[PDB]
Coordinates of C-alpha atoms and ligand atoms in Angstrom, one line a residue:
Chain A
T3 CA 108.1 126.6 89.5
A4 CA 106.9 125.3 93.0
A5 CA 103.7 124.6 91.6
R6 CA 104.1 122.2 88.7
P7 CA 102.6 118.9 86.9
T8 CA 104.8 115.8 86.9
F9 CA 105.3 114.9 83.2
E10 CA 107.6 111.9 84.4
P11 CA 106.8 109.5 87.3
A12 CA 108.9 107.9 89.7
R13 CA 110.3 104.4 88.5
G14 CA 110.0 101.2 90.8
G15 CA 113.1 99.1 91.7
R16 CA 115.1 101.3 94.2
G17 CA 113.7 100.9 97.4
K18 CA 112.6 98.3 100.2
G19 CA 112.1 95.1 98.4
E20 CA 113.8 96.1 95.1
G21 CA 116.9 94.5 94.4
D22 CA 118.2 93.1 97.7
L23 CA 115.4 93.8 100.1
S24 CA 116.9 97.4 100.5
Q25 CA 120.1 95.4 101.7
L26 CA 117.7 93.3 104.1
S27 CA 116.1 96.0 106.4
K28 CA 115.2 94.9 109.9
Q29 CA 112.4 97.4 109.6
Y30 CA 108.7 96.0 108.9
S31 CA 105.2 97.4 109.8
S32 CA 102.2 96.2 111.5
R33 CA 100.5 95.4 108.2
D34 CA 103.7 93.2 107.6
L35 CA 103.1 90.7 110.3
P36 CA 101.9 87.0 109.6
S37 CA 98.2 87.1 108.6
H38 CA 96.0 84.9 106.6
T39 CA 99.1 82.3 106.3
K40 CA 96.8 79.6 104.7
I41 CA 95.6 79.4 101.1
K42 CA 92.2 78.2 100.9
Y43 CA 91.3 75.8 98.0
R44 CA 88.0 75.4 95.9
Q45 CA 86.2 72.4 97.2
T46 CA 84.3 69.6 95.3
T47 CA 81.1 71.5 95.5
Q48 CA 82.3 74.8 95.0
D49 CA 84.2 74.9 91.6
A50 CA 87.2 72.6 91.7
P51 CA 89.1 72.3 88.4
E52 CA 88.4 68.6 88.1
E53 CA 84.6 69.6 88.5
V54 CA 85.0 72.2 85.8
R55 CA 86.9 70.3 83.2
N56 CA 84.2 67.6 81.8
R57 CA 81.5 70.1 81.7
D58 CA 79.7 71.2 78.8
Chain B
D99 CA 125.4 91.7 65.9
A100 CA 128.6 92.3 67.9
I101 CA 128.1 96.1 68.1
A102 CA 124.5 95.4 69.3
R103 CA 125.2 92.8 71.8
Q104 CA 127.9 94.8 73.9
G105 CA 127.1 94.1 77.4
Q106 CA 124.8 90.9 76.8
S107 CA 126.0 87.4 76.9
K108 CA 126.1 84.8 74.1
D109 CA 122.6 83.0 75.0
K110 CA 120.7 86.4 74.7
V111 CA 118.3 86.4 71.7
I112 CA 118.3 89.7 70.3
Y113 CA 117.1 90.9 66.9
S114 CA 119.3 92.9 64.5
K115 CA 118.5 92.0 61.0
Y116 CA 116.2 92.6 58.2
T117 CA 115.2 89.0 58.3
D118 CA 113.6 89.3 61.4
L119 CA 110.8 91.5 60.0
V120 CA 109.5 89.3 57.3
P121 CA 106.3 87.5 57.8
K122 CA 106.4 83.8 58.2
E123 CA 103.9 81.4 56.3
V124 CA 100.3 80.8 57.0
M125 CA 101.6 77.5 58.8
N126 CA 98.7 75.4 57.3
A127 CA 97.0 73.4 60.2
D128 CA 97.5 71.7 63.8
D129 CA 101.1 71.5 63.2
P130 CA 103.6 69.9 65.4
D131 CA 105.9 72.9 65.1
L132 CA 103.7 75.2 67.0
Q133 CA 102.8 73.2 70.1
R134 CA 102.9 74.1 73.7
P135 CA 106.0 71.7 75.0
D136 CA 104.5 68.9 76.9
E137 CA 102.0 68.4 79.7
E138 CA 104.9 66.6 82.1
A139 CA 107.6 69.3 80.7
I140 CA 105.3 72.1 81.6
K141 CA 104.9 70.3 85.2
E142 CA 108.5 70.0 85.6
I143 CA 108.9 73.6 84.7
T144 CA 106.1 74.2 87.5
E145 CA 107.9 72.2 90.2
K146 CA 111.3 74.0 89.4
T147 CA 109.5 77.3 89.6
Chain C
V196 CA 141.3 71.3 103.5
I197 CA 139.4 73.9 105.4
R198 CA 137.0 73.5 108.1
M199 CA 134.2 76.1 107.9
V200 CA 132.1 77.1 111.0
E201 CA 129.9 80.0 110.7
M202 CA 130.6 82.8 113.2
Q203 CA 127.8 82.7 116.1
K204 CA 125.4 85.7 115.9
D205 CA 124.6 87.9 119.0
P206 CA 120.9 87.8 119.8
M207 CA 121.2 91.1 121.4
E208 CA 123.0 93.2 118.7
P209 CA 121.4 95.9 116.7
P210 CA 122.2 96.3 112.8
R211 CA 125.6 97.3 112.2
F212 CA 125.7 99.5 109.4
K213 CA 123.9 102.5 107.7
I214 CA 121.7 101.2 104.7
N215 CA 119.5 104.3 104.0
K216 CA 122.5 105.6 101.7
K217 CA 121.0 106.5 98.4
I218 CA 122.5 106.6 94.8
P219 CA 121.3 107.5 91.5
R220 CA 120.0 104.7 89.0
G221 CA 122.6 103.1 86.9
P222 CA 122.8 102.5 83.2
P223 CA 120.2 100.2 81.6
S224 CA 121.0 97.3 79.6
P225 CA 122.1 97.9 76.1
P226 CA 119.5 99.1 73.7
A227 CA 117.9 96.8 71.5
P228 CA 117.5 97.6 67.9
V229 CA 114.0 99.2 67.1
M230 CA 112.8 97.3 64.2
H231 CA 110.1 99.5 62.7
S232 CA 108.8 99.7 59.4
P233 CA 110.0 101.9 56.5
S234 CA 107.9 104.9 58.0
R235 CA 105.0 106.4 56.4
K236 CA 105.6 109.6 54.4
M237 CA 104.2 112.9 56.2
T238 CA 102.5 115.6 54.2
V239 CA 102.6 119.4 55.0
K240 CA 99.0 119.6 55.2
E241 CA 98.5 116.9 57.9
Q242 CA 101.6 118.1 59.8
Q243 CA 99.6 121.5 59.9
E244 CA 96.2 120.2 60.8
Chain D
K213 CA 139.0 138.6 83.7
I214 CA 140.2 135.2 84.9
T215 CA 143.9 134.6 85.5
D216 CA 145.7 131.1 86.1
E217 CA 143.7 128.0 86.1
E218 CA 142.8 128.2 89.7
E219 CA 139.8 130.7 88.7
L220 CA 139.3 128.8 85.5
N221 CA 138.6 125.7 87.4
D222 CA 136.4 127.7 89.6
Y223 CA 134.4 128.8 86.6
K224 CA 134.2 125.4 85.4
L225 CA 132.9 124.1 88.6
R226 CA 130.1 126.7 88.8
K227 CA 129.1 125.8 85.3
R228 CA 129.3 122.1 85.7
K229 CA 127.3 122.4 89.0
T230 CA 124.6 124.3 87.0
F231 CA 124.2 121.8 84.4
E232 CA 124.5 118.9 86.6
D233 CA 121.5 120.5 88.9
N234 CA 119.5 121.2 85.5
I235 CA 120.0 117.4 84.7
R236 CA 118.9 116.5 88.0
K237 CA 115.5 118.0 88.1
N238 CA 114.5 117.5 84.4
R239 CA 116.0 114.1 84.2
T240 CA 114.7 113.9 80.3
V241 CA 114.2 117.1 78.5
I242 CA 117.1 116.2 75.9
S243 CA 118.3 119.8 75.3
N244 CA 119.9 120.3 78.8
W245 CA 122.2 117.3 77.9
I246 CA 122.9 119.1 74.6
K247 CA 123.7 122.4 76.0
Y248 CA 126.1 120.7 78.7
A249 CA 127.9 118.8 75.9
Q250 CA 128.4 121.9 73.8
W251 CA 129.7 123.6 76.7
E252 CA 132.0 120.8 77.2
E253 CA 133.0 120.7 73.5
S254 CA 133.5 124.4 73.5
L255 CA 136.4 124.1 75.9
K256 CA 138.0 121.1 74.2
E257 CA 137.4 118.7 77.1
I258 CA 135.6 116.3 74.9
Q259 CA 136.0 113.3 77.1
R260 CA 133.5 114.8 79.4
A261 CA 131.1 115.3 76.5
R262 CA 131.5 111.7 75.3
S263 CA 130.5 110.8 79.0
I264 CA 127.6 113.4 78.6
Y265 CA 126.4 112.0 75.2
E266 CA 126.6 108.5 76.7
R267 CA 124.7 109.3 79.9
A268 CA 122.1 111.1 77.5
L269 CA 121.9 107.9 75.2
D270 CA 121.4 105.7 78.3
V271 CA 118.4 108.1 79.1
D272 CA 116.7 108.1 75.6
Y273 CA 118.6 105.9 72.9
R274 CA 115.5 106.6 70.4
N275 CA 116.2 110.3 70.1
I276 CA 117.8 110.8 66.7
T277 CA 119.2 114.3 67.1
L278 CA 121.0 113.3 70.3
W279 CA 123.2 110.6 68.2
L280 CA 123.6 113.2 65.4
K281 CA 125.2 115.8 67.7
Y282 CA 127.4 113.1 69.4
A283 CA 128.6 111.8 66.1
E284 CA 129.0 115.5 64.5
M285 CA 131.1 116.6 67.6
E286 CA 133.4 113.5 67.0
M287 CA 133.5 114.4 63.2
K288 CA 134.1 118.2 64.1
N289 CA 136.9 117.5 66.4
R290 CA 138.8 115.3 63.9
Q291 CA 138.1 112.1 65.6
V292 CA 137.3 110.2 62.5
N293 CA 137.6 107.1 64.4
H294 CA 135.2 107.6 67.3
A295 CA 132.4 109.3 65.1
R296 CA 132.8 106.0 62.7
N297 CA 132.2 103.6 65.7
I298 CA 129.2 105.9 66.7
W299 CA 127.7 105.8 63.2
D300 CA 128.1 102.1 63.2
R301 CA 126.4 101.7 66.5
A302 CA 123.6 104.3 65.4
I303 CA 122.6 102.5 62.3
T304 CA 122.6 99.3 64.1
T305 CA 120.3 100.3 67.1
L306 CA 118.2 102.8 65.0
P307 CA 118.0 101.0 61.6
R308 CA 115.1 102.6 59.9
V309 CA 116.2 106.1 60.6
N310 CA 117.6 107.3 56.9
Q311 CA 119.5 110.2 58.4
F312 CA 122.1 108.1 60.0
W313 CA 122.9 106.0 56.9
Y314 CA 122.9 109.3 54.8
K315 CA 125.4 111.1 57.0
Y316 CA 127.7 107.9 57.4
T317 CA 128.0 107.3 53.6
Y318 CA 128.6 111.0 53.2
Chain E
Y613 CA 87.9 96.8 150.5
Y614 CA 84.3 96.3 151.0
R615 CA 85.2 92.6 151.9
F616 CA 88.2 93.7 153.7
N617 CA 86.8 96.6 155.9
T618 CA 83.7 94.7 157.3
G619 CA 83.5 94.7 161.1
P620 CA 85.9 96.3 163.7
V621 CA 88.4 97.1 160.9
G622 CA 87.8 100.6 159.9
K623 CA 88.4 102.7 156.8
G624 CA 92.2 103.1 157.2
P625 CA 94.8 102.2 154.5
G626 CA 96.2 98.9 155.9
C627 CA 95.0 96.6 153.0
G628 CA 97.9 94.7 151.1
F629 CA 96.1 92.0 148.9
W630 CA 98.0 92.8 145.8
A631 CA 97.3 89.7 144.1
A632 CA 94.5 91.0 141.9
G633 CA 96.3 93.9 140.8
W634 CA 99.4 92.0 140.3
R635 CA 97.4 89.6 138.1
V636 CA 95.9 92.4 135.9
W637 CA 99.2 94.1 135.3
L638 CA 101.1 91.1 134.4
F639 CA 98.3 90.1 131.9
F640 CA 98.7 93.7 130.6
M641 CA 102.6 93.1 130.1
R642 CA 101.7 89.6 128.6
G643 CA 100.1 91.4 125.4
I644 CA 102.6 94.7 125.5
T645 CA 105.6 92.6 125.4
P646 CA 105.1 91.8 121.4
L647 CA 103.9 95.3 120.8
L648 CA 106.6 97.1 122.6
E649 CA 109.3 94.6 121.0
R650 CA 108.3 95.5 117.5
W651 CA 108.1 99.2 118.3
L652 CA 111.5 99.3 119.9
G653 CA 112.9 97.2 117.3
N654 CA 111.9 99.4 114.5
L655 CA 113.2 102.3 116.8
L656 CA 116.6 100.9 117.0
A657 CA 116.5 99.7 113.2
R658 CA 115.9 103.3 112.3
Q659 CA 118.5 104.7 114.6
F660 CA 121.4 102.0 113.4
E661 CA 120.1 101.3 109.9
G662 CA 118.7 104.8 108.7
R663 CA 115.5 106.0 107.5
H664 CA 114.3 105.0 104.1
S665 CA 112.9 108.2 102.6
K666 CA 110.7 107.0 99.7
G667 CA 111.3 103.3 100.2
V668 CA 107.9 101.9 101.3
Chain F
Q57 CA 124.9 71.1 129.7
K58 CA 125.6 74.7 130.4
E59 CA 125.9 75.2 134.1
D60 CA 125.3 77.8 136.8
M61 CA 127.9 80.6 137.5
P62 CA 128.9 82.1 140.7
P63 CA 126.7 84.7 141.6
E64 CA 129.3 87.5 142.1
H65 CA 130.3 87.1 138.3
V66 CA 127.3 89.2 137.2
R67 CA 127.6 91.3 140.1
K68 CA 131.1 92.5 139.2
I69 CA 130.3 92.7 135.3
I70 CA 127.1 95.0 136.2
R71 CA 129.3 97.2 138.7
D72 CA 132.2 97.6 136.3
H73 CA 129.9 98.6 133.6
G74 CA 128.7 101.5 135.6
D75 CA 127.0 104.1 133.6
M76 CA 128.8 103.3 130.4
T77 CA 131.2 106.3 130.6
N78 CA 134.5 104.6 130.6
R79 CA 136.5 104.5 127.6
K80 CA 137.3 100.8 128.1
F81 CA 133.8 99.8 127.6
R82 CA 133.0 101.5 124.5
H83 CA 132.5 98.4 122.5
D84 CA 129.6 97.1 124.7
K85 CA 127.5 100.5 124.1
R86 CA 126.1 99.2 121.1
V87 CA 124.9 95.9 122.8
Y88 CA 123.0 97.6 125.5
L89 CA 121.1 99.6 123.0
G90 CA 120.4 96.3 121.0
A91 CA 119.0 94.6 124.3
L92 CA 116.6 97.6 124.8
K93 CA 114.2 95.7 122.5
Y94 CA 114.2 93.0 125.0
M95 CA 113.6 95.2 128.2
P96 CA 109.7 94.6 128.3
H97 CA 110.1 90.6 128.3
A98 CA 112.6 91.0 131.1
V99 CA 110.2 93.3 133.0
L100 CA 107.4 90.7 132.7
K101 CA 109.9 87.7 133.9
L102 CA 111.0 89.9 136.5
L103 CA 107.2 91.1 137.9
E104 CA 106.0 87.5 137.1
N105 CA 108.3 86.2 140.1
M106 CA 107.5 88.8 143.0
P107 CA 108.0 87.2 146.2
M108 CA 104.9 86.6 148.2
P109 CA 104.5 88.4 151.2
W110 CA 105.1 85.4 153.5
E111 CA 108.7 85.0 152.1
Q112 CA 111.8 87.1 153.0
Chain G
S446 CA 82.0 97.3 140.3
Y447 CA 80.5 93.8 140.6
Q448 CA 78.4 94.5 137.2
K449 CA 81.7 95.5 135.4
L450 CA 83.8 92.6 136.9
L451 CA 80.9 90.4 135.5
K452 CA 81.2 92.0 132.1
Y453 CA 84.8 91.4 131.8
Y454 CA 84.2 87.7 133.0
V455 CA 81.5 87.2 130.1
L456 CA 83.8 89.0 127.5
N457 CA 86.3 86.5 128.7
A458 CA 84.0 83.3 128.2
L459 CA 82.5 84.6 125.1
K460 CA 85.7 85.3 122.9
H461 CA 87.4 82.1 123.5
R462 CA 89.2 81.0 120.8
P463 CA 90.7 77.6 121.3
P464 CA 94.7 77.4 122.0
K465 CA 95.4 77.0 118.2
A466 CA 98.3 74.2 118.5
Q467 CA 101.7 76.1 117.1
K468 CA 105.2 75.2 117.2
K469 CA 106.8 75.9 120.5
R470 CA 109.1 78.7 120.6
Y471 CA 111.3 78.7 123.8
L472 CA 113.1 81.9 123.5
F473 CA 115.4 81.4 126.6
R474 CA 116.4 78.3 125.6
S475 CA 117.5 79.9 122.5
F476 CA 119.3 82.7 124.2
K477 CA 121.4 80.4 126.8
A478 CA 122.5 78.0 123.8
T479 CA 124.5 80.8 122.5
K480 CA 127.9 81.9 123.7
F481 CA 126.5 85.3 125.2
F482 CA 124.2 84.3 128.0
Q483 CA 125.3 82.5 131.2
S484 CA 123.1 81.7 134.1
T485 CA 123.1 82.1 137.9
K486 CA 121.1 82.3 140.8
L487 CA 120.3 85.5 142.7
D488 CA 118.2 87.3 145.0
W489 CA 115.1 88.7 143.3
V490 CA 115.9 92.4 144.7
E491 CA 119.3 92.3 143.2
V492 CA 118.0 91.2 140.1
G493 CA 115.3 93.9 140.2
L494 CA 118.0 96.7 141.0
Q495 CA 119.8 95.1 137.9
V496 CA 116.8 95.5 135.5
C497 CA 116.1 99.0 136.7
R498 CA 119.9 99.9 136.2
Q499 CA 119.8 98.4 132.8
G500 CA 116.6 100.1 131.7
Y501 CA 118.0 103.3 132.8
Ligands
IHP701 O1 86.7 108.9 148.4 P1 85.6 107.7 148.5 O2 84.8 107.7 147.4 O3 85.1 107.0 149.8 O4 86.8 106.5 148.1 C1 88.1 106.4 148.6 C2 88.9 106.2 147.5 O5 88.8 105.1 146.8 P2 87.8 105.2 145.4 O6 89.2 105.5 144.5 O7 87.4 103.9 145.0 O8 86.9 106.2 145.5 C3 90.2 106.2 148.1 O9 91.3 105.9 147.1 P3 91.8 107.1 146.1 O10 91.0 108.2 146.7 O11 93.2 107.5 146.7 O12 92.0 106.7 144.7 C4 90.6 104.8 148.9 O13 91.8 104.5 149.6 P4 93.0 104.4 148.6 O14 93.7 105.5 148.4 O15 93.9 103.5 149.7 O16 92.5 103.4 147.6 C5 89.5 104.6 150.1 O17 89.5 103.7 150.8 P5 89.3 103.8 152.4 O18 88.4 104.8 152.8 O19 89.0 102.2 152.7 O20 90.8 104.0 152.8 C6 88.0 105.0 149.4 O21 87.1 105.3 150.5 P6 86.0 103.9 150.8 O22 86.9 102.7 150.9 O23 85.2 104.3 151.7 O24 85.5 103.6 149.3

């Protein structure tokens, strides 16, 4: 009735980023702003993959 | 197979026969058949991707 | 021969059309053959247990 | 008592609305599809029921009694050739189900 | 006012030195411009595009 | 270069689009709401240039 | 009041991250490159009455 379990979940692929970006919506949240726009990479002393390759 | 690939194209690899369920051989050793393609080919796929 | 210029967009113009319209999920791509084994025979005893 | 086919179409409108609403909520639950298709085959509107079984096989293609009911509708309604197509597609997609092969060779 | 109402000048109204308050409310506008442009943009986008029910 | 226009041009445009109730200007109703998202920036550029009590 | 204004100045001087050299955007040069904006020269009071009527 009203109080009931699920037994099937919702399937993704039909909203906001799923097929055509909801047909290119001009709606965007505060959490979707540019933030941390630069990937850090491992340096020579950190564990760069060149340093990790020769090691036994 | 044509009644299995109705809405698919001609490049799609579907499996529809008994001879897809048969186990292959032990494939003795470091064979050039089961090898990851090439390092530069992998880098080219990476660049395109 | 055709010269294509792209129409110049108004900066001050809101989105034009309703996008929130919602329709049910279409059919999935044609079913793949299931390729199982012959199937283990089931007993009355284990079916009841 | 229903008279001429305006009222018959009103009956059909009510029944189709009820079944399509049960399909909307349950979504899966294969019996809902079977009841609606049996109701469509009872009124000899079997193209509707072809649509319903094809939608139900889109939902769940591995459910073997659904293939069985669809093929037995097409056999029962003297559509030898549709049913024969269905059996060919059934034994192609679910080949280890022996039910399908027995009924098609029978 | 304490610098303005110093000597013979009393505690009347008579003081227009709006440079300071003017700067304070323009520096407010400097930061409220992006916030209100985003908020009004999503307002207009929901009015003209429509609301996405279970999209996000 | 795009040059200056006579100052009576924007005056008559603003005056003919009075409160946007004429049926003749019903195609520009959509653009004014679109321009709503840039009103805070127009307010900022307006009040930034307030004329300085020694100026008439 | 002097203590609080000192507090505001010290919080300015502390959290001064350097200007963070970006790519310049020039919004109004992008508006007047289009075919929808003209440019003129008006009295400030006429523009303020325009901006108020437009916001209304
Ligand atoms: O009632 P007081 O404690 O003496 O303070 C008032 C008050 O200023 P404060 O808000 O700083 O208390 C008045 O402003 P409001 O009461 O309207 O907020 C202000 O006059 P303005 O209304 O013009 O700001 C007035 O200044 P003045 O008395 O010089 O006219 C000033 O009194 P003091 O100047 O003696 O502090």
